[PDB]
Every structure is written in C-alpha cells, then in structure tokens.
Amino acid sequence: MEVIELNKCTSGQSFEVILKPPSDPSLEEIQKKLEAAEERRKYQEAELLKHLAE
Amino acid sequence: MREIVHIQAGQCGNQIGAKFWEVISDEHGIDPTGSYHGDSDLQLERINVYYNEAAGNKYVPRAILVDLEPGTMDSVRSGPFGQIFRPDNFVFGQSGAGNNWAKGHYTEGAELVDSVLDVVRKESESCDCLQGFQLTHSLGGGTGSGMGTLLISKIREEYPDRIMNTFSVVPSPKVSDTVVEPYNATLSVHQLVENTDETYCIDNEALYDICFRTLKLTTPTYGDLNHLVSATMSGVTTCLRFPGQLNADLRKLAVNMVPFPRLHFFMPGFAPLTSRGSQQYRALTVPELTQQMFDAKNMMAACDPRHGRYLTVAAVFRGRMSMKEVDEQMLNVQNKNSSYFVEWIPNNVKTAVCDIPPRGLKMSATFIGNSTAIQELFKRISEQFTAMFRRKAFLHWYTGEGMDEMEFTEAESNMNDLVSEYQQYQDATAD
Amino acid sequence: MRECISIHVGQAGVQIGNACWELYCLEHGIQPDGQMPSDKTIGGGDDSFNTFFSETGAGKHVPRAVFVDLEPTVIDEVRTGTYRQLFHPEQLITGKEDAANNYARGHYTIGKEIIDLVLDRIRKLADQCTGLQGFLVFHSFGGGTGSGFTSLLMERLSVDYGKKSKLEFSIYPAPQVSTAVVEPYNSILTTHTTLEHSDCAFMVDNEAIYDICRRNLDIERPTYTNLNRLISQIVSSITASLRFDGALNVDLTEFQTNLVPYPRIHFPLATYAPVISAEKAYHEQLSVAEITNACFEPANQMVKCDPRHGKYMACCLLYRGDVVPKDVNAAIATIKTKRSIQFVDWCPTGFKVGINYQPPTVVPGGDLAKVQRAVCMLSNTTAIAEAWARLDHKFDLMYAKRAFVHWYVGEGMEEGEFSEAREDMAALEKDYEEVGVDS
Amino acid sequence: MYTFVVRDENSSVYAEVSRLLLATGQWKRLRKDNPRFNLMLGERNRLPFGRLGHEPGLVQLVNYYRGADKLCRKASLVKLIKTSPELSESCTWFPESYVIYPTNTDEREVFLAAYNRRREGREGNVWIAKEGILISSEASELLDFIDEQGQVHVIQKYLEKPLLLEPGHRKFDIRSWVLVDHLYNIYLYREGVLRTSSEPYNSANFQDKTCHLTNHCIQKEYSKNYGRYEEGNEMFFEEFNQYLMDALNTTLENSILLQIKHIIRSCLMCIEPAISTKHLHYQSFQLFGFDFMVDEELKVWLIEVNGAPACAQKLYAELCQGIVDVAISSVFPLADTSIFIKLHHH
Numbered sequence A: 001m002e003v004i005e006l007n008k009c010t011s012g013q014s015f016e017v018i019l020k021p022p023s024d025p026s027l028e029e030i031q032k033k034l035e036a037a038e039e040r041r042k043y044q045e046a047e048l049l050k051h052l053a054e
Numbered sequence B: 001m002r003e004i005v006h007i008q009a010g011q012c013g014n015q016i017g018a019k020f021w022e023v024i025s026d027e028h029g030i031d032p033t034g035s036y037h038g039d040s041d042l043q044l045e046r047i048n049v050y051y052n053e054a055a056g057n058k059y060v061p062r063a064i065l066v067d068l069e070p071g072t073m074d075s076v077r078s079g080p081f082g083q084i085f086r087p088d089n090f091v092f093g094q095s096g097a098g099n100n101w102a103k104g105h106y107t108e109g110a111e112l113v114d115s116v117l118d119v120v121r122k123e124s125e126s127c128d129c130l131q132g133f134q135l136t137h138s139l140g141g142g143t144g145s146g147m148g149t150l151l152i153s154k155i156r157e158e159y160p161d162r163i164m165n166t167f168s169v170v171p172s173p174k175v176s177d178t179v180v181e182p183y184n185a186t187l188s189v190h191q192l193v194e195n196t197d198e199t200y201c202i203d204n205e206a207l208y209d210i211c212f213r214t215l216k217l218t219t220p221t222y223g224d225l226n227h228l229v230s231a232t233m234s235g236v237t238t239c240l241r242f243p244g245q246l247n248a249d250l251r252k253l254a255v256n257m258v259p260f261p262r263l264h265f266f267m268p269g270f271a272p273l274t275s276r277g278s279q280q281y282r283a284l285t286v287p288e289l290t291q292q293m294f295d296a297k298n299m300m301a302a303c304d305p306r307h308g309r310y311l312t313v314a315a316v317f318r319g320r321m322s323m324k325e326v327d328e329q330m331l332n333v334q335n336k337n338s339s340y341f342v343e344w345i346p347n348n349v350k351t352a353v354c355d356i357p358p359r360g361l362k363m364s365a366t367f368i369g370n371s372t373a374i375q376e377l378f379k380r381i382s383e384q385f386t387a388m389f390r391r392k393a394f395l396h397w398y399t400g401e402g403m404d405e406m407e408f409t410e411a412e413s414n415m416n417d418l419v420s421e422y423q424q425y426q427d428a429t430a431d
Numbered sequence C: 001m002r003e004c005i006s007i008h009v010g011q012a013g014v015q016i017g018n019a020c021w022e023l024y025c026l027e028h029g030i031q032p033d034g035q036m037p038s039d040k041t042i043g044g045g046d047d048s049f050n051t052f053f054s055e056t057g058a059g060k061h062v063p064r065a066v067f068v069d070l071e072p073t074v075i076d077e078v079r080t081g082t083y084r085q086l087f088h089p090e091q092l093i094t095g096k097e098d099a100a101n102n103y104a105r106g107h108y109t110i111g112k113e114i115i116d117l118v119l120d121r122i123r124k125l126a127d128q129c130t131g132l133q134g135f136l137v138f139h140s141f142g143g144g145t146g147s148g149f150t151s152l153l154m155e156r157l158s159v160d161y162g163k164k165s166k167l168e169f170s171i172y173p174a175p176q177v178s179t180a181v182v183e184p185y186n187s188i189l190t191t192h193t194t195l196e197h198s199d200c201a202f203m204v205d206n207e208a209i210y211d212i213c214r215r216n217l218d219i220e221r222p223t224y225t226n227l228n229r230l231i232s233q234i235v236s237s238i239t240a241s242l243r244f245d246g247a248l249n250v251d252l253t254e255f256q257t258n259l260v261p262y263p264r265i266h267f268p269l270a271t272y273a274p275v276i277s278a279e280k281a282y283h284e285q286l287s288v289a290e291i292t293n294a295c296f297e298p299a300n301q302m303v304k305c306d307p308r309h310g311k312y313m314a315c316c317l318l319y320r321g322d323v324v325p326k327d328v329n330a331a332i333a334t335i336k337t338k339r340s341i342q343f344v345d346w347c348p349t350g351f352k353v354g355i356n357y358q359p360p361t362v363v364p365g366g367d368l369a370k371v372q373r374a375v376c377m378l379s380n381t382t383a384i385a386e387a388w389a390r391l392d393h394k395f396d397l398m399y400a401k402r403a404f405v406h407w408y409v410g411e412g413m414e415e416g417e418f419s420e421a422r423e424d425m426a427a428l429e430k431d432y433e434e435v436g437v438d439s
Numbered sequence D: 001m002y003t004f005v006v007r008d009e010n011s012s013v014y015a016e017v018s019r020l021l022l023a024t025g026q027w028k029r030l031r032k033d034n035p036r037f038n039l040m041l042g043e044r045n046r047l048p049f050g051r052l053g054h055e056p057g058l059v060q061l062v063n064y065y066r067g068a069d070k071l072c073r074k075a076s077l078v079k080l081i082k083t084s085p086e087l088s089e090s091c092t093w094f095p096e097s098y099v100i101y102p103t104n105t106d107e108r109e110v111f112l113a114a115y116n117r118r119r120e121g122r123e124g125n126v127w128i129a130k131e132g133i134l135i136s137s138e139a140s141e142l143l144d145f146i147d148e149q150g151q152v153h154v155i156q157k158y159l160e161k162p163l164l165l166e167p168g169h170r171k172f173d174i175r176s177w178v179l180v181d182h183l184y185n186i187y188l189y190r191e192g193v194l195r196t197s198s199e200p201y202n203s204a205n206f207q208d209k210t211c212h213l214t215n216h217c218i219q220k221e222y223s224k225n226y227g228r229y230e231e232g233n234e235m236f237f238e239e240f241n242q243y244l245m246d247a248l249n250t251t252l253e254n255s256i257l258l259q260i261k262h263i264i265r266s267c268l269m270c271i272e273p274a275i276s277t278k279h280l281h282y283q284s285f286q287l288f289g290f291d292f293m294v295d296e297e298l299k300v301w302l303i304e305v306n307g308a309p310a311c312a313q314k315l316y317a318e319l320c321q322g323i324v325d326v327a328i329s330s331v332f333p334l335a336d337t338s339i340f341i342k343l344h345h346h
C-alpha cells in the first residue's frame, strides 16, 4: 500500500512498502571455567595412573 | 598424518595380523619389498596411517610382532610378505605360554613386555600425530590372551590419551579342544572391558559355522577361518585407510559407536561371503549387499541380532555403485526393522561408500554393529567358565603361577555385570 | 567505509568459506591471483568491495578472512587450491588433532591450545581496519570444532571487541550428510553458549539444501560441493548489501535493527528463488510475481518449517537482476490476498526491499543456470522454532539414558552443562511460542 | 509394509482404523515414540507437527490438519466468521454470536448494543452460553454466569423457533461427518444422524435443559422418555427423509442437505490457504463433525465443528473403512460404490 524511503543509485534501488501499521562474561570468568575443566581432566587422569600403578 | 601402531601377539594374533598386512598391502599397491606399484593416488593419500616411509620411497608397516615362542614368527618371515616387516620389530621369547593366561600376563610375559614397549616407544616417537594402537590376538591361548592384555594396560599407562583398538578372536570348542580356554577368555574380557576403546569380537564359533554351513567346507582349516578374518579386517579399517568423511579415525569411530564406556564390543559382518581361492563371477546388487550384511548368517560373532537391539551401526560399502541406491537400501533396512534399533539414539546407523573394491570382488559391504545381542557370546563363555570354576577344575595351572581364586571370581563377576549391562539397554525405551 | 572480517571454523565453515570467496571474486571481477583490473585506486580505496577485501601495494585484493580448523586436511586444500595466491599464510590456521565431533574437545581440550593464536591472527586483520564493523562467523552446529571452538571464540570476541557486531552462518545438522550421532548435543551446547554473543544468525538446514539440490537441480545424491555452491548464493545475497552500493543493510548493525527486535529471537529464515538446473536447456524465465511468491513456499526455504503457523516480526526482500519497484509492489499486493502472512501486533505489516541490478553470478561448471532475476527473502518468523523443537527432542532422547555423555565428561565437562544448555533451549522455545501463538 | 503409530488411545474412531489396518496384513503398528512411521494417528492436543516430515525415505501422513482448531474451538469459529472476508456478513447461516471474556480483544460492549435493540424492538431475545450451558433472556443472568465460570465463553442467539419432529414435538441436531484428504478433497459421509430430544419442546421454561439441549450424554442421564421414539435418540437419514416426505412434502436432499453442503464447503474452503499441506514436507487428513440446527422454515444453521468427532455405533464399520480407503490407502496403496459425496470446489 504505502511506499516509503525510496533510494535510487547506479547499482540498484531500495525502499520499504508498508501494508498496515502496528496495533557478558569477563576474560577471568572464561579462563576460570576453562581451567576448572582442565583440572577435572587432570584429576581423572591422575586417578587412572593411580589405578594402573596398583 | 594420524598414524596407527599395529601389534600382533601369539599364534592367532600373528597369523591374522600377517593376513591383514598381505591384504591391505595389495589394496595399497605395495609389494613384498615395500615398493609402490599401484595405479591410483587414492592408494597413497593416507598410506602413513599404517606405513612408515623410508629411503627410496619404501613403505614399512608400523607393525610390531610379539610372541613368547619363535615358531609363528619364523613362519611369518618365511611367508610371502615376511620380508616387508622391520626386522628390529620382531620381539620374541623361547619358552611359550602353554595356553596359560597367568604365564602370558604375570610370569613369562612380564619378562618380554619391556622389550616390546621399547619397540612401541620407537614407533610412537616417529609419529607426526599418533592416533592409537590396534592389537590382533586370541583370548583362548596364553600369549595373545595374557600378554596381549598386559601390553594393552602397559601401553595405556604411557599413552593414556590414545585410542586402543583390538581384533580379539573369541574361542569355541568347534575349533579348539583346549579345556582351559574359557578361563583365559574370561580373564582377558575383564581386561578389555576396562582398557580398550573398541574391540571387534571375532568369534571362532561364527567363523567355523560360516565355513561349514554357508561356504560348504566340510573340513575347514585355520586358513579358511582367517580368510573371513582378513576380509573383515580390510572392511572395518577401510575408513581409516582411504579418503572419506565418516569414521576416518579411531576416535571419531569410538565417538559414533560407543555410547557407554564398557559397551565397546562390536559384532563385525561381511557380504558377500567367499571361499578361499573361489572366484565370484556375478557381482552383488546394492539390495543384496544390504540384506546380507545385516543377516545373522553373515556375522563374525555367533549372536542373533534379532535377539537384541542395535545401539549403533556403521556400514561400509566398497566398489562402483549408485550412492542413491545405498542411501535408499540403508533407509529401507532401518525403516522395515525399526524395532531392532534403540529409539533413544536417533540416526544411529552411519554409512560410508569407498570407490576402491577389495581384491577379487567388484562390490562388497562390511558391517560393524554395537548390538546388545553380543551378550549371547559372553553368556556362552560364562557358562563354560562356571562349569569348571564351580569345581575349581584346572586351577592349579594358574595358582601355580602365583594367581589366586579371587581373580577368577572377579573376572567372572565383571563379565556377568557386562551381560546384565547389555540387557539393561536392550530393555530401555524412549519412555 | 567500515570493514567486515569473516571467520571460517571447522570443515563446514572452511569449505563454505571457499565457495563464498570464489563467488565474491567472480562478482567483483577479482582474478584468482587477487588482481582486480577494474580497480583504479592501487594499494587502497574505500569502495564498497573494500568492506570484504583489503589491498596490497601490488594491487592484490586480499579477503578480510581467517580460516581456522583443528585439522590440517581441509585448509591444506585452500593453501594449494585455485585461490591459494589470494590469502596470506597467516590467515590459514590449523592444528594436528581435531575435536572428534565432541563439543568438549573443541571448546576445552584442543580449542584452548589454539584460541590465543587465532585471536592474535584476527587482531592483525582488525588493525588494518580504519573502522571495523564486526564479524561473520561460518561454522557447523554438528562438528566438534564448528560447535565447541566457535562458542569459545564468540565468547573471546565479545571480550576483545565489545562494540563490534557478530553474525553467524550456522550449518544445522541433517542425517542425510551428518557424520556423528552426537550432533544434537553439540548443536544444543553451542547454541546455548553462543546465544548472548551473537547479534544475528542465519541457520542453514542441510536437509533443506539437500532436498533443493535433488528436487530443483536434479542431483541424484548431492555432495558438499553441490550443497556449498547453493549455500554460497544465499550467503552472497545476504552480504551483497555490504559489498555493493545501496541503502538497505549497508552495515551489520542494520541487520539486527531490520531483522531482530527481540535479542534472543535472532534467527531469520532465508528463502531463495529461483534455483534452476544448468542441464535444463530451455527454462521459462520466471517473473517478479513468480519468484516473490516462491519465497512463501517451504520447499524453497533454508530451514524446512511452516511460517503460516507462526508470526512475523520483520520481513525483508533482497532482489538481484532485472527488477523495478513497481513489479515488487504489485507482487506483494497479489501475495497478501492469497497467502497467510500474520505479523506480531507490535510490528507493522510490511517489507523492506532492496534491489541490485546485477543478476546472480554463477560459478562456471556449476549446477545453477544463469537467471535474469533472483530474490532472497529474510523473514524473522516464529516458525523457525520448529528447528529447535526437532533438535531438542533428539537431545532429550539420548540425554535420558546419558548416551555418549561420558565422552564429554572425560574432556572436563559436567552433566550440569548439558541440563543448563537444555533449560536455555526450553526457555528459547517458550519465548518463540509466547510471541507467535494465542491459545 | 507400511508403518503407523497410535498416540490417542481414547479415540474410538481411530481405535477402529488401527484395528482395520492391521487386519489388512500390509500395515504394522510401531511403539508410539518410534519416529520411523508412514502414518500418525496423533494426540488431541500439543500434536508435534514440527517433528513430522523430516524422516528420509518415508512419506509421512497425519490424521489432523494443523490450524483446524480455528474452525473447531467455539470462540475461534465466531472470530473466523466475523473477521474472514470470505465468510463475511453475507453469512446468513451462523447464529448471531459474540466472544465474551470474564471480567478478570473482547466483544462484550457490542453484545449489549445489539441486545438492547432486540429489547425495545419487541423481537425474541433468548440467548445461550458456550452441561456447562445456560439459556436465558436476561443479559444480566448470562453475563454473571460467565464471570463465575472463569473460562472464555460465547453468547449465541438461541434458535427460538426450531423445527419440531412429530409425533413428540421434539428439538434435534444433525451431525454430519466430513473427511478432508491430503489433496483437500472434501468428502461428506452420506450417512448422518439426528441427535433428538426425547421430551417435547417447552417454549416457556428454559431451566429444564433436557428438552432444549439435544446432546446424547444429557439425554441418557436426565431424559425421562429416552429411546421411546427411536433407538438411542438417533434417527437416521432413511427415516428422516421419509418423515419430511410424508409431513412436509419435501426431501432431505432439497430442504436441508443443499444448505449443509454449502456451509461445509464455505467453512473448509475459507481456511484452506492456512491449513492445506499441498506442498508441505508432510501431508494431513482429518475427520470433522459439523453440527446443525434446522429452523421451522427448513433453514439450516451451523452450531459447531468438532475436530475429534466420534461416530454413531451403527456407522463406525462403514465410515472407518472409508477413512482407510479414501484418506490412508490413497497415499499408501495396498496390493490388489462410494460412501462419500465429494463436495466440488476450485
């Protein structure tokens, strides 16, 4: 129905056609999480080597 | 690249290991000297997975040959491809293991294990990025069974972040009359449950029944049984040896196949089944390869898939065929047999197609299934074990080597827990 | 002129990145060696194509891009490919051991070892920018690198470039080309982790692309080469407004302004028509009415779903070729009286249209025929939440039995991360339903 | 072999359809959450339409049309008649209705504007709300009832001069069964039922709801003369056409079915662009139950549409085979004249 904001140029053109109107974490927090995961991997591996040593 | 280190232990391990190298060396156009004489670059694209390069473009298997007896390793040197293996990689003892697991794992094997580990370290050092290890062995004897599982545990101690894959030949009275094999096999399955990532259950019961019933071989030899093993080993390692998308390394295979850590024993399968020396003149159609590979008669583990449920499956088609037709037939199998696939693991069957067929066949398909029906195999070993253990029969052979009854009781309990765990997931439902 | 840095993570991101840069080169007239004869300002300039290409003193037009993968194989084919001379070695980054289709390996174990090297290489591109706009991140939801490494990188990019926009081109998993059983886990873990860090994301269901290749291009069993060429045409339609003269979607912030009113509901649905076979000798050239109407067909959508059973928050039409505004308004008028197109009460029922007179460029030896006009509709519809429901249900089936969870826990992840991610997806599904439904 | 899932155990109609499909030797019932099915006989509410159509190598069909709730919910049917330009105020077959919300968007003000026109106009003024029903001429009684119920109701003009069957002087409602297949062909089942009141129609006292509400449930419980005129208060079209011929010198076809067929077509054609699965990744089919009232001048009015209708005991065998033949086997053909009337439309 209503065509608005028409802009023409050599590459093309653009406009809006309206039919009806309406009715983060820190660097420290990232490293803390990443090293808590690495420590859990290390704990799991130490337990495996403790087990294999037995 | 991603290098695999292969280890073969005992008579069975070295026999099937030697046939593996003969088969894949032919597929990769490598002659017994270790020279390439092939026609396709796909043969050499991923050659460093199993072979080391050397002076004058020579390819040497990254294989380590182990035995507490010189016998079978003298036969491998005398064999066709024996000349291709690195001589310093032949580690062997003089007194055997006499089909005694305790000898291989605690006394005789304990002496030779450090020499093998030196060869393993040398092969692992020269790896750009080692992915893991693959052992070939049987579980009924003494060296492959006992020493093989000691090696698995000692390797896991030095390389805890690497994948451990095995081709374990499960014993059967149809092939062997050694009375103590159920003890050796139960003791090894206990080790495999805790220390391997992927184990292909190569059952001698299934290989014998395939030879006798299907291939009509009234008197099957070990060569006939091993002809099925080498065909299966070629098929299950195709994804590791050639360029491709699915299960291209041991870790991606484990992540797709193993949903629970202890449930890592696979039912291998192959289509078309072929007799050693027999030529196959009519190629199979894609619907035929598909029906046969999922059929109970084509399984290398003597279990009925219709008696359990598939947790995961990997299908590998080899040869020139319609990629649209394999997709249609794989969906056809899953949709017309949906009861046999766990509903709580969506899209659990993955398919790979490789253009290079194996020697002698224009088209083939290899199946790798993590089915709960594998408990039938462990129940069979467990019944045989309990029949003798119930009366402490033959135990002096093991207690004489320092072992106690409690190890047998614990090995017995751990396998019964493995069976009950496979049953738990068979009976589990999406609600 | 404000710059845009593209980042391609994992095999899917890298291979789709190749199809895109190859296509951008053909569209801008940049040769494989980086030389652009039509560019008369050597060594620099602030032209529209300079938002994606920097310039050396020797006249080489170098993509503002970084390719990262935890495996060498895929990026090695870029290092030795037809556009190998187009990129500096410092833009191509690889590891040795991949994430093995495991979000935890990509985010934690392997990813942690290469994250600083990647941010360093991204900062070298950012320092050549007089006014960095933000980033375009290409990755799969299913892969271990694509899911885990991307979410790690998106978190670090929020910290290092707080005022810079981040758009995504995410490959949503389809079993017809999937390579892992755990892809629902990786998809829900990455969606949860990246949600606060992404301003706008364009999901591409491989199933939808796969079916368009089979149905419209008559390809028996499409390969990633077939899928990626079709995907690159849709990506090119979306970035055309950043690389060419125009007024609609000239910068990255305009994408969130025009397509994303609610920050969490930042997944627009892309629909592209016409997709026609090159093998087809004779084809009736479609009209503006025909191609615009096809934007309301689920068969031409990048994510298969039903927008009639949902609501629109923002619709936007991107035309390429022989198109005049009179044709678009007539098409929209005839469509409104035929199709069911309901907008949320707090938004105006309307379309933002952009036209570029250059028709779509097709890579020679391709599957798509040359066409006189083509369109890409981007619509923020609440019906795209069907994609989340499907993936969340597969996650639920496996997580009930904890199937495969041990692989994640073994790399340092906790079971609580899985339920935390699933509660966020349950919240996201609920947000979509609140907005788009009445009963 | 075809495969199917059953997710509504309470559906009497689809319990027979599953019974019939298995009895053919070409269909297999899977566990309800098995996704590898060709046919879904889905749940009544929260049916997962988002999950249908994404299983490669399987044509998936479902027994419900997504978006048909607009026609089958009472408040939705009023909004659909009023706001659809296709149905319009050229809709002379739907009784005057208003969506009323409890005082806890709403057309409560316009109800009182039209009510006071009928008060001073001296014309009839009895209405009906949405067991759980109230018929009265006092607007205050009806509005105070809905506030106490708490749920959203509709105030419809009660048909004050209904057609009354003789002997008995009784009110009735016609239930028509309509099946719409995946190709949006509309099928009217030739057999219908008259759900009759067993007591004479009392024009004075509306609190005696048994002579005013012709539902089968209220009749078997509160009826005093149940089954005296016809078995189960169900008179079928063979008898009803004969009654009209003998008493009114007309036929069921001419006097009533032309109007019923017009209403069924108008209602379902209006929503076609919203619910049609013609180019969807999954196909839908659905059984509907249209309820009608006939006034004293043989004019048909639409009372409501039921999305999960139940059939008459006598007719389940015939209708359920037609669902299999027409809606299921048309998509999934079996190996090796019509109970329906195709309502033509373009």
Ligand SMILES: COC(=O)[C@H](C[C@H](Cc1ccccc1)NC(=O)c1csc([C@@H](C[C@H](C(C)C)N(C)C(=O)[C@@H](NC(=O)[C@H]2CCCCN2C)C(C)C)OC(C)=O)n1)NC(=O)OCc1ccccc1
Binding pocket: B015, B173, B174, B175, B176, B177, B219, B220, B221, B222, B223, B224, B225
């Ligand atoms: C020139 O020879 C060849 O080309 C062949 C050499 C291979 C090499 C090799 C491979 C792997 C391991 C060792 C050696 N040899 C064999 O294939 C081979 C050697 S023994 C053997 C044997 C195996 C049998 C089982 C069933 C597979 N087997 C043990 C038996 O058949 C014996 N019977 C039983 O054990 C029964 C007895 C009754 C109770 C139940 N038991 C299970 C039997 C040998 C007594 O198979 C055969 C047929 O010997 N395979 N092939 C070669 O040398 O074959 C040996 C051979 C075959 C035929 C005739 C003479 C010798």
Ligand SMILES: Nc1nc2c(ncn2[C@@H]2O[C@H](COP(=O)(O)OP(=O)(O)OP(=O)(O)O)[C@@H](O)[C@H]2O)c(=O)[nH]1
Binding pocket: C009, C010, C011, C012, C013, C015, C016, C069, C070, C098, C099, C100, C101, C102, C106, C140, C141, C142, C143, C144, C145, C146, C147, C171, C172, C173, C174, C177, C178, C179, C183, C206, C224, C227, C228, C231
């Ligand atoms: N469309 C498309 N999808 C792809 C492509 N490559 C992979 N995928 C999809 O991406 C998913 C797997 O992610 P990948 O990109 O291969 O994995 P990755 O990012 O490299 O991660 P890892 O290999 O686990 O380290 C599956 O859904 C594949 O189908 C590609 O080039 N195009």
Ligand SMILES: Nc1ncnc2c1ncn2[C@@H]1O[C@H](COP(=O)(O)OP(=O)(O)CP(=O)(O)O)[C@@H](O)[C@H]1O
Binding pocket: D095, D128, D130, D156, D157, D158, D159, D160, D172, D173, D212, D213, D214, D215, D291, D293, D303, D304, D306
């Ligand atoms: N406006 C009206 N005029 C006259 N009678 C009416 C009426 N509205 C309802 N009735 C009577 O009341 C009965 C119940 O109405 P309605 O059909 O809306 O209830 P319901 O939906 O709970 C039962 P069903 O869905 O099985 O038909 C009708 O069958 C009809 O006999």
Ligand SMILES: Nc1nc2c(ncn2[C@@H]2O[C@H](COP(=O)(O)OP(=O)(O)O)[C@@H](O)[C@H]2O)c(=O)[nH]1
Binding pocket: B009, B010, B011, B012, B013, B015, B016, B097, B098, B099, B137, B138, B139, B140, B141, B142, B143, B144, B145, B169, B170, B171, B172, B175, B176, B181, B204, B207, B222, B225, B226, B229
């Ligand atoms: N399939 C197969 N089984 C074999 C072979 N050699 C031995 N076996 C089986 O392996 C078991 C004996 O183990 P073995 O490997 O001989 O003992 P080890 O040398 O002490 O490891 C029995 O079950 C044999 O039947 C062979 O080449 N092929």
Ligand SMILES: [Ca+2]
Binding pocket: C039, C040, C041, C042, C043, C044, C045, C046, C047, C055
């Ligand atoms: Ca310039």
Ligand SMILES: [Mg+2]
Binding pocket: B010, B011, B069, B141
């Ligand atoms: Mg021996």
Ligand SMILES: [Mg+2]
Binding pocket: C010, C011, C071, C098, C143, C145
């Ligand atoms: Mg990868």
Ligand SMILES: [Mg+2]
Binding pocket: D304, D306
């Ligand atoms: Mg009702």
